[PDB]
Scaffold this active site. Structure first.
Site, PDB file in Angstrom:
ATOM      1  N   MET A 164      38.517 -19.548 -51.814  1.00  0.00           N
ATOM      2  CA  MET A 164      39.946 -19.791 -51.649  1.00  0.00           C
ATOM      3  C   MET A 164      40.461 -19.858 -50.235  1.00  0.00           C
ATOM      4  SD  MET A 164      42.380 -20.462 -53.755  1.00  0.00           S
ATOM      5  CE  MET A 164      43.751 -19.571 -52.972  1.00  0.00           C
ATOM      6  N   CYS A 165      39.991 -18.976 -49.365  1.00  0.00           N
ATOM      7  CA  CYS A 165      40.485 -19.054 -48.011  1.00  0.00           C
ATOM      8  C   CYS A 165      40.040 -20.387 -47.425  1.00  0.00           C
ATOM      9  CB  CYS A 165      40.015 -17.861 -47.160  1.00  0.00           C
ATOM     10  SG  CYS A 165      38.246 -17.826 -46.819  1.00  0.00           S
ATOM     11  N   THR A 166      38.852 -20.865 -47.783  1.00  0.00           N
ATOM     12  CA  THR A 166      38.411 -22.149 -47.231  1.00  0.00           C
ATOM     13  C   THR A 166      39.323 -23.288 -47.697  1.00  0.00           C
ATOM     14  OG1 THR A 166      36.042 -21.521 -47.069  1.00  0.00           O
ATOM     15  CG2 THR A 166      36.554 -23.862 -47.042  1.00  0.00           C
TER      16      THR A 166
END
Ligand SMILES: Nc1ncnc2c1ncn2[C@@H]1O[C@H](COP(=O)(O)OP(=O)(O)OP(=O)(O)O)[C@@H](O)[C@H]1O
Ligand SMILES: [Mg+2]
Ligand SMILES: [Zn+2]
EC number: 6.2.1.64
Lengths: 76, 789, 530, 176, 76
Positions: free
Chosen positions: B562-564
């Site tokens: 998700m952060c990516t």
């Protein structure tokens, strides 16, 4: 102790390993020469698939033994 | 599905649909249960279609010769009444309405060919054929022929041929034999030679077709013609007198026209099966029913008593099986040619003999090689024989999971190896992208159920094959559905489904007295494919590595952090995911609620466009429409060749297991061909603590008179287990039953009573499996109850 | 209906692309003999969309044929095989042009001595070693691609005969990255230099390409050793630790989790590999075909020559920068910026390499524009992956003084190595030479022929002087086959054979080097150079 | 050891299940390892059918405190590989629940994993009423308000629970 | 001794523990009964989130300690 490992293309490479070495190390040795990310390596030896924690010894890998990289495909 | 409580009856237009519906009105009036009768066009063609996908009519009326097909496809349910009620009807009609030694329909009406003669000219009907020619000389002396009937059809001519011993297909005690035809024997050769002589002696002409002979008798120009209950209409419009006289015997033996049976079949899916025993055995199979139905436009003795019968009596019943159609074509031209002096009756019938058979000379030649001979490499239980092939051809039930890719390839492969009893399950519909490798589908099929089309293509291309389709998810059938098969092969495209079928088959295992019972094992052959890599494996549940044992062999699962995706995109795929799982759900571009459909061109375009912009903000290049579909659909590259290699191997192994011709693949094979072509085969080790196949049921011994409480004490006290508060369930009468549960007051209250009833009272039985779960058991465990009394 | 073609071919375009699909649609293949094997092979070519095929079969559809073939109906019995098959193989894909000729290869090799020149590749199935050897001769001399396929009982045989097959886009399954940390180039070194691993806030330090991280510390170790670079596992491990310590720490003094550096630790095992020319690429360079050009020298070799010069000039002893890097944990800009350096660098070397081919086309007379740029790009991206395959001619295999015995013999150390299956095929062919038939075709012949065959085996083994022992079991098993052609075995070959043919047309991926043998008995398989 | 398929037809039986499905075995375990929070309550109309049941949540915090919500669970035959079907039967103004009853909980759609159990779902659901997710909205407007105006959202919530309108749709009173 | 770790969706997991146990052993059971890997697991018992290497005793933890869990937003 030199052992042979055959890749998914049938290419066989020679690697130097010690009875005390860990299975993930074998993978690293493979990646060094072939570029195959150890994360996607699945090694078989005498019908057993090698755990990363176990050692070359636990699987009783002898001198000119041959290891094979394997895979399971999911497409139908 | 089909509506419960009511009975939708199907029948034909030209069959009195009004005097019968009234026999359905007296039904609801007497029971409250309603009747809806319809006469759909092509219903004999529409039934197989709907009877396959479950729905359709509860009952249907048609000639027995069709039900042979339905029965085989499993579209009919075995009817079962007493011998006392079977005496109300005739003893022979039941065969015409039978399949595999089972009755499948209730006889309604019957039909047969008889000889109709112009009464005035000769009020003596001939008792045999020998004399028939003697008359042409008299009538011709007047300008007429004694006889005249359609010769262009083997139905009208068959009665005479069969006289001395002509039989369509050999009928052994319970089933027809499609390998032994009775059109090559002296009984037929004799009968045909005669018909031909009259063709040469000019007593007749091979050109006398139905319409010609018709227009002649309609003027009263011949003594007789052959017909039946369907032709009496135009002879009444021409005031030409006639009769329904007997069919001239021949060479001693009697004549044998063909026999048709109108009958009603009970759909195999219609849950209203017990509602059909009534409306039929009572509200129809009477004088009150049949007459009310008959007054509109029989097999029941009582009403029948109140010439057509004699013929049908001494004549052989018209086959129902599928091979029958190849019979007609075979003998039709085997007569045309004959009478036309195009070939000798002998050689003519020689042809009909083989052409009507199902297995032409040499057809299974490549298979027979491995089943009839011997060798230094056969499976230790192998024994040369001609039965193995018959096993393959007649009873070996094989299931193919997945139509398309491996599936399509497997059907082809199994069909050309002897297998005929095959089923195909697939939950999908056809897509244009399937057409680059799934060879059983064509552009015109797009949108149709794969299984359906796969079955129809194969049953046609490979004659005598009986593929039965199933437009479903394997997940919507139960343990009883998969046990009927001897072997199961897979061409699935998801791990979940494989984990599932793998679990279903292990659940069928029975470990009687400590040792696994070999007959409870249904071998599983599985293959997978991706680009130019593929794999195959043979699994014997409870004996060798199962799907879960090798579960780790799958490459790492495609996963985007998700952060990516949300904050640090760097690959074009990253942008596409953002749009797919964040931007879409938040904008619902095609309407609030409307989910994303990867197959919808307009959805992909929107996604592609929005992705181009996300990419833009991050100077990420490489976003193409092709890649957008890839990411969204999670596409796996595919081609025909790799699916052929793997389906080949899988199939070769189904063959070996079904015949024991050789020992099967020692479970595993990998294949790859980007660099030359390579394979590797090995015995995957069976995981010691496999969560799926390493747990055996625990054996407990109690008296049938014991009280469920004792079973609870055992579980809680027994030194080796001693659980806190177990939960006990069981399968009785096909439904789950909660015997005792104590973590939900409303349930515990309601099951406590069970605690003081005997295991004989609760319905349990010897061998029965009690499923009990508890904080002590990481997963529910199975105890096998063994009765000591 | 073009936007329709791309819809039904999607799954395969994802494998060989639009160019490959085009090569495929411009091809014309020839299938000789339409039995299960041939028809299976052809089906796997028709569906993917080969341009056209032609079946050459003089035989008639037998009872057997009709039984093990998905493309022969019952009524086709008696009629011509080529004509019957062609009809069903054509319903598979209307974008394919099928045609046939009802004559044997023999007749054609008599009347039209150059009949097989109109095809891209010629596929031959179930041929006697007579029609075979003869056919291989003609085609070999016409420089035409030949693939011989045999299905004997549970055995699959495949012989590929191409004098020379050079491939650029070999699609390697896995390969080492071309990071160039061991031999940085101008722009690359400038890039790393722009990074100050100490004066970066916590986040920027946490979102820095591991490739950068390693480039830096690699510079620090180049100091404390006076010009060295890790080489031993002991040293590599030291270096791993040097990095493991750059990880910013928290308030407690505990290490902050930075997958940033962890990847550095892990990729050290390869990052430090020495950029160098693959031995295989060497062979192409030092090869006569590359050493000496001509107005005849085909594209590949001119291109290979270019690279060769580039290496000695701008390359500075190394091949052009690939231009791609793998994915890693970093923030967009950091990654894109690092990635761009490699892209531009690649483009550049591409140009360099280009100016050496125009240098060669104008020295050979060819038009400096025949080789397009979209084509030059692949040559560069794949310089490390070039491959050249050369098959010995069928003749050199059968010839009494060229037969490769060094291999056949060594292989036989294992009485079960599939090679024994080849030995048995040669012998089977011998037997068929002497008696105009195959062993055990009828059940009543098996007994007898078991011995007759054992003879031919020896007659063969002796003729080439082969000291090898063959378990008698194989002899019996082969007679037992009765030269049967089981559908599942023909189907396995059909897949394997087709893809090899597509490798030939598209010139993508790599083909096998000689003989492939398959055993459906034990589901094992192997390749040999023969 | 060797296996050999016997060449005889199989003994028939009617389509009645004889062995417990994997779903039945897993749910039996999950139901028995139940751990309902003080605010939740589970119920089974039929004690023999552990595949169907209803859950009731009477939260005591956040914007929905003082209300009652009735969710129904339908466990399919693919459990635990497939998640259970969960539908809301109480009409409510919520960012993740539409007016058809469809709920949008992550672990019920893409984040589902067979290691998860009924407990996981009940907690995942309970936490939805504490803090709604405006990233997977089945009720767009409801989600928007929650982000931009935090107080208005809270208001609209109380008024809808008491019985009344939001825009032009009447929300049924759902107070405990 | 007795301790519980409040997983967010509202569950305080009793993975009963000893004092000399390092913070790192909990995550492993937070990882069993729940399956969450220790790595993707940050734990805060006072503003200061506990250090793996440390023990339960290193945080004045008596026979009545409730904890709270914050899983690490791991992976790039
Ligand atoms: N649970 C399931 N029950 C029944 N069939 C299933 C199940 N899961 C997958 N299948 C079927 O398995 C088959 C696998 O075939 P395959 O992947 O080759 O085709 P596909 O789904 O059309 O491919 P693609 O996704 O690349 O378009 C499909 O036809 C699919 O519908
Ligand atoms: Mg799919
Ligand atoms: Zn297992």
């Amino acid at each position: 102790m030199l052992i042979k490992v055959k890749t998914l293309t049938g290419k066989e490479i020679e690697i130097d390993i010690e009875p005390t070495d860990k299975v993930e190390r074998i993978k690293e040795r493979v990646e060094e020469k072939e570029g195959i990310p150890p994360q996607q390596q699945r090694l078989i030896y005498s019908g057993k698939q090698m755990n990363d924690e176990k050692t070359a010894a636990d699987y009783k890998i002898l001198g000119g033994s041959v290891l094979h990289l394997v895979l399971a495909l999911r497409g139908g | 599905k089909i509506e419960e409580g009511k009975l939708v009856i199907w029948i034909n237009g030209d069959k009195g649909y009004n005097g019968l519906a009234e026999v359905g009105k007296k039904f609801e009036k007497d029971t409250g249960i309603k009747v809806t009768v319809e006469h759909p066009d092509k219903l004999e063609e529409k039934f197989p279609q709907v009877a396959a996908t479950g729905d359709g009519p509860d009952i249907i009326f048609w000639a027995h010769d069709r039900f042979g097909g339905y029965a085989q496809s499993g579209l009919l349910a075995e009817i079962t009444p007493d011998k006392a009620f079977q005496d109300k009807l005739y003893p022979f009609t039941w065969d015409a309405v039978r399949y595999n030694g089972k009755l499948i329909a209730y006889p309604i009406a019957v039909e047969a060919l008889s000889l109709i003669y112009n009464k005035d000219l000769l009020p003596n009907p001939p008792k045999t054929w020998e004399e028939i020619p003697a008359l042409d000389k008299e009538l011709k002396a007047k300008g007429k022929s004694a006889l005249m009937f359609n010769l262009q059809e083997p139905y009208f001519t068959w009665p005479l041929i069969a006289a001395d011993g002509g039989y369509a297909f050999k009928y052994e005690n319970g089933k027809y034999d499609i390998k032994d035809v009775g059109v090559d024997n002296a009984g037929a050769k004799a009968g045909l030679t005669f018909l031909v002589d009259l063709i040469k002696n000019k007593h007749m002409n091979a050109d006398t077709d139905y319409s010609i002979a018709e227009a002649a008798f309609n003027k009263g120009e011949t003594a007789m013609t052959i017909n039946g209950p369907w032709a009496w209409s135009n002879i009444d419009t021409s005031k030409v007198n006639y009769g329904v006289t007997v069919l001239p015997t021949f060479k001693g033996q009697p004549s044998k026209p063909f026999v048709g049976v109108l009958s009603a079949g009970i759909n195999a899916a219609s849950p209203n099966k017990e509602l059909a025993k009534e409306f039929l055995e009572n509200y129809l199979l009477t004088d009150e029913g049949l007459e009310a139905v008959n007054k509109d436009k029989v097999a029941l003795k009582s009403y029948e008593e109140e010439a057509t019968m004699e013929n049908a009596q001494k004549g052989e019943i018209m086959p129902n099986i599928p091979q029958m159609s190849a019979f007609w074509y075979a003998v039709r031209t085997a007569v045309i040619n004959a009478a036309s002096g195009r070939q000798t009756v002998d050689a003519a019938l020689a042809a009909a003999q083989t052409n009507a058979a199902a297995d032409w000379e040499g057809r299974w030649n490549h298979v027979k090689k491995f089943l009839e001979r011997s060798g230094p490499f056969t499976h230790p239980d192998f024994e040369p024989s001609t039965e193995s092939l018959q096993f393959l051809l007649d009873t070996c039930k094989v299931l193919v999971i997945g139509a398309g890719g491996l599936g399509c390839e497997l059907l082809k492969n199994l069909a050309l190896s002897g297998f005929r009893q095959i089923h195909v399950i697939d939950m999908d519909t056809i897509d244009v992208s399937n057409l680059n490798r799934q060879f059983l589908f064509r552009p015109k099929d797009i949108g149709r159920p794969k299984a359906e089309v796969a079955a129809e293509f194969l049953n046609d291309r490979v004659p005598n094959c009986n593929v039965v389709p199933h437009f479903n998810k394997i997940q919507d059938f139960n343990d009883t559905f998969y046990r009927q098969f001897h072997i199961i092969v897979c061409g699935l495209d998801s791990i979940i489904a494989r984990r599932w079928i793998n679990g279903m088959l292990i659940s069928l295992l029975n470990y009687e007295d400590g040792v696994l019972d070999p007959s409870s094992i249904v071998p599983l052959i599985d293959g997978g494919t991706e680009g130019f890599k593929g794999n195959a494996r043979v699994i014997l549940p409870g004996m060798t590595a199962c799907i879960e044992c090798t579960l780790e062999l799958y490459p790492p699962q495609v996963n985007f952090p998700m952060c990516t995706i949300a904050s640090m995109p760097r690959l074009p795929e990253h942008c596409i995911e953002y749009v797919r799982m964040l931007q879409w759900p938040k904008e619902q571009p095609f309407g609030e609620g409307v989910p994303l459909d990867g197959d919808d061109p307009e959805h992909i375009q929107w996604i592609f466009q929005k992705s181009l912009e996300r990419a833009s903000q991050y100077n990420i290049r490489g976003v193409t429409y092709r890649l957008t579909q890839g990411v969204v659909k999670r596409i796996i590259p595919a081609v025909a060749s790799t699916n052929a290699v793997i389906a080949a191997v899988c199939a070769t192994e189904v063959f070996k297991i079904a015949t024991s011709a050789y020992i099967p693949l020692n479970n595993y094979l990998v294949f790859n061909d980007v660099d030359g072509l390579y394979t590797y085969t090995f015995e995957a080790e069976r995981k010691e603590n496999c969560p799926a196949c390493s747990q055996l049921p625990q054996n407990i011994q109690f008296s049938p008179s014991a009280k469920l409480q004792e079973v609870l004490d055992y579980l809680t006290n027994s030194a080796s287990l001693q659980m806190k508060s177990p939960a006990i369930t069981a399968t009785l009468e096909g439904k789950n039953r909660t015997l005792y549960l104590q973590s939900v007051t409303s349930i515990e209250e309601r099951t406590r009573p069970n605690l003081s009833k005997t295991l004989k009272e609760l319905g349990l039985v010897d061998g029965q499996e009690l499923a009990v779960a508890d904080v002590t058991t990481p997963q529910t465990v199975l105890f096998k109850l063994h009765f000591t009394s | 209906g073009k936007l329709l073609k791309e819809q039904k071919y999607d799954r395969q375009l994802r494998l060989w692309g639009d160019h490959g699909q085009e090569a495929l649609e411009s091809a014309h293949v020839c299938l000789i003999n339409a039995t299960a094997t041939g028809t299976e092979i052809l089906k796997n070519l028709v569906l993917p969309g080969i341009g056209s095929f032609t079946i050459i079969d003089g035989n008639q559809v037998s009872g057997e044929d009709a039984g093990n073939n998905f493309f022969l109906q019952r009524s086709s019995i008696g009629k011509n095989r080529a004509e019957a098959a062609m009809e069903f193989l054509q319903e598979l894909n209307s974008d394919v042009s099928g045609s046939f000729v009802e004559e044997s290869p023999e007749n054609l090799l008599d009347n039209d001595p150059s009949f097989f020149c109109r095809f891209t590749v010629v596929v031959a199935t179930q041929l006697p070693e007579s029609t075979s050897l003869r056919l291989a001769d003609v085609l070999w001399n016409s420089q035409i691609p030949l693939l011989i396929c045999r299905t004997y009982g549970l055995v699959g045989y495949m012989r590929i005969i191409i004098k020379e097959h050079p491939v650029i886009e070999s699609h390697p399954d896995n390969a080492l990255e071309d990071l160039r940390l061991d031999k940085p180039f101008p722009e690359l070194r400038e890039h790393f230099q722009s990074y100050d691993l100490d004066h970066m806030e916590k986040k920027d330090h946490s979102h820095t390409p591991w490739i950068v991280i390693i480039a830096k510390y690699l510079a620090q170790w180049y100091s404390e050793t006076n010009g060295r670079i890790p080489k031993t596992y002991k040293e590599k491990e030291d270096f791993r630790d040097l990095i493991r310590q750059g990880i910013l720490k928290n308030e407690n003094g505990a290490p902050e989790d930075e997958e940033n550096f962890e990847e550095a630790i892990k990729n050290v095992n390869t990052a430090l590999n020495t950029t160098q020319i693959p031995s295989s690429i060497e062979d192409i360079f030092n090869d006569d075909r590359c050493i000496n050009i001509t107005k005849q020298t085909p594209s590949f070799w001119i291109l290979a020559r270019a690279l060769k010069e580039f290496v000695a000039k701008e390359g500075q002893g190394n091949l052009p920068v690939r231009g791609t890097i793998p994915d890693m944990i970093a923030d967009s800009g950091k990654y894109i910026k690092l990635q761009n350096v490699y892209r531009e660098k690649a483009k550049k070397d591409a140009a360099a390499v280009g100016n050496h081919v125009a240098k060669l086309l104008q020295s050979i007379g060819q038009a400096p524009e025949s080789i397009s740029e979209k084509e030059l790009k692949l040559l560069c991206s794949n310089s490390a992956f070039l491959r050249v395959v050369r098959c010995r001619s069928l003749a050199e295999e059968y010839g009494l003084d060229t037969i490769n015995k060094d291999e056949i013999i060594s292989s036989m150390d294992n009485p079960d190595n599939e090679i024994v299956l080849y030995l048995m095929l040669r012998a089977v062919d011998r037997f068929h030479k002497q008696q105009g038939r195959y062993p055990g075709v009828s059940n009543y012949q098996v007994e007898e022929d078991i011995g007759k065959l054992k003879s031919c085996l020896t007659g063969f083994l002796q003729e080439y002087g082969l000291s090898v022992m063959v378990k008698d079991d194989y002899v019996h098993e082969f007679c037992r086959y009765g030269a049967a052609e089981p559908h599942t075995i023909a189907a396995f070959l059909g897949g394997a054979a087709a893809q090899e043919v597509i490798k030939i047309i598209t010139k993508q991926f790599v083909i096998f080097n000689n003989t492939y043998i398959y055993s459906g008995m034990s589901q094992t398989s192997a390749t040999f150079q023969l | 050891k060797l296996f050999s398929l016997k060449q005889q037809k199989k003994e028939e039986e009617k389509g009645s299940s004889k062995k417990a499905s994997a779903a039945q075995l897993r749910i039996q375990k999950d139901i028995n390892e139940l751990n309902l929070p003080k605010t939740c309550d589970i119920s089974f109309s039929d004690p023999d059918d552990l595949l169907n049941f209803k859950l009731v949540i009477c939260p005591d915090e956040g914007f929905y405190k003082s209300g009652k919500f009735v969710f129904s669970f339908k466990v399919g035959q693919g459990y635990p590989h497939d998640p259970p079907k969960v539908k809301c039967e109480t009409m409510v103004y919520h960012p993740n629940i539409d007016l058809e009853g469809n709920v949008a909980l992550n672990i019920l759609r893409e984040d589902w994993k067979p290691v998860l159990t009924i407990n996981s779902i009940i907690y995942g659901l309970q936490y939805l009423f504490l803090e709604p997710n405006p990233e997977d909205p089945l009720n767009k407007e409801a989600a928007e308000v929650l982000q931009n105006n935090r107080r208005l959202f809270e208001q609209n919530v109380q008024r809808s629970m008491r019985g009344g309108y939001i825009g032009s749709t009447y929300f049924e009173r759902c107070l405990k």
